[PDB]
Amino acid sequence: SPGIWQLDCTHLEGKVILVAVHVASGYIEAEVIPAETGQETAYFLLKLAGRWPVKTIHTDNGSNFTSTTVKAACWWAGIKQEDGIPYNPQSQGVVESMNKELKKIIGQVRDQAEHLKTAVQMAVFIHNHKRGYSAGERIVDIIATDIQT
Amino acid sequence: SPGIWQLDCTHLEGKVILVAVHVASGYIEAEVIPAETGQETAYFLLKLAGRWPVKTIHTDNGSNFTSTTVKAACWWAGIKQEDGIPYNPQSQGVVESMNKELKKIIGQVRDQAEHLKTAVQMAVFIHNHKRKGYSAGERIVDIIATDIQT
C-alpha cells in the first residue's frame, strides 16, 4: 500500500538514528536525532508526513513511539499508528534488509565525513539512488499511480 | 525543469529557517537550522538531494551558500550551483509567493506548538497538502514521475 511506513530507532557511535522505510519501495528517510524522545520522534514524523502521503506507521512499543506527543502528531497529521512488533514478518523482513543495506553504506562512507549525521545523509542518498529502478523512483511511481486511482 | 530548487534563508523569532522551493510545483521543504552556517546549509542540502532528484540549486551570494562546505556537498551530490539567482521573473515570482504563503501558514498555527521548529513543519505539511486542482505534494510527485516515464 502507498502509505505504509515502518519506523525504527537504531544506535550507532553512541548516537540515535530514526529510520523510516517505505515498505512497498524500500525508500529510506533517516536522521541522527539529539535524544531517543517522543518529541524528536513526533518532530521527525511531522517532517516525514508533510513530504509523503503517510497513512499508517508501524513501530515497536518503545517509549518514544507511544508517548502523547507522538499520538498528537499522528492525530494532527491523520496518521494511523499501528504499534507492536511482530505485526507482519514479510514486511518486517523487507524493512530489516533496507536497514541492513543502510548500515553497510554508512560503513563504506564513514571516513568521507567527520560527523555521523553527514554520513547517514550520504548513505540515504546512495541507498535511494542505487539501481532498473531506484527506491527514489519506485516511491514516486507508487504515489503517482495512487493519485491516478 | 523538474530538477531545479531555490534555497533561501529567512528569519522568525530570531531563529534561522532554510526554505527550499521546487520551482515547477511550488512544493516546499523547510526547517529551522541551529545557525546560518555553511555546515548547516550543506547538511540540509544532502538531506534534500537524498529525498528528491536535485539537479540544480539557485541560491544568493551569501557567505553560507558560497562556502567551501556547500560547494563540496553540491559536487558530491552532482548538483549544479549557479552564480547567484539567475534573472527569471516567473521563477522568482513562484519562490517569493510560496515563501509569503509559508509565513502566513506559520502565523496561523504558531499557537498550536511551543517551539517554532514544530510550527514550521506543521506549516510545511499544510502548505504541501492544501488542495486549492492538485496540492503541491501531488504536483511534485506527478512532475517527477512524468519525467521518469518520458
Ligand SMILES: O=C(O)Cc1sc2nc3ccccc3n2c1-c1ccc(Cl)cc1
Ligand atoms: O480534539 C482533540 O482530539 C483534542 C485535541 S485539540 C488539538 N489541537 C492540537 C494541536 C496540535 C496537536 C494536538 C492537538 N489537539 C488535540 C489532541 C489530539 C490527540 C492527542 Cl493525543 C492530543 C491532543
Ligand SMILES: O=C(O)Cc1sc2nc3ccccc3n2c1-c1ccc(Cl)cc1
Ligand atoms: O564532514 C562533515 O561532518 C561535514 C563537513 S564539515 C566540512 N568542511 C569542509 C570543507 C571542504 C569540503 C567539505 C567540508 N565539510 C564537510 C562535508 C561536506 C560535504 C560532504 Cl558530502 C562531506 C563532508
Ligand SMILES: O=C(O)Cc1sc2nc3ccccc3n2c1-c1ccc(Cl)cc1
Ligand atoms: O510544542 C512543541 O514544539 C512540540 C510538542 S510538545 C507537546 N506536548 C503535547 C501534549 C499533547 C499534545 C501535543 C503536544 N506537544 C507538541 C506537539 C505535538 C504535535 C503537534 Cl502537531 C503540535 C505540538
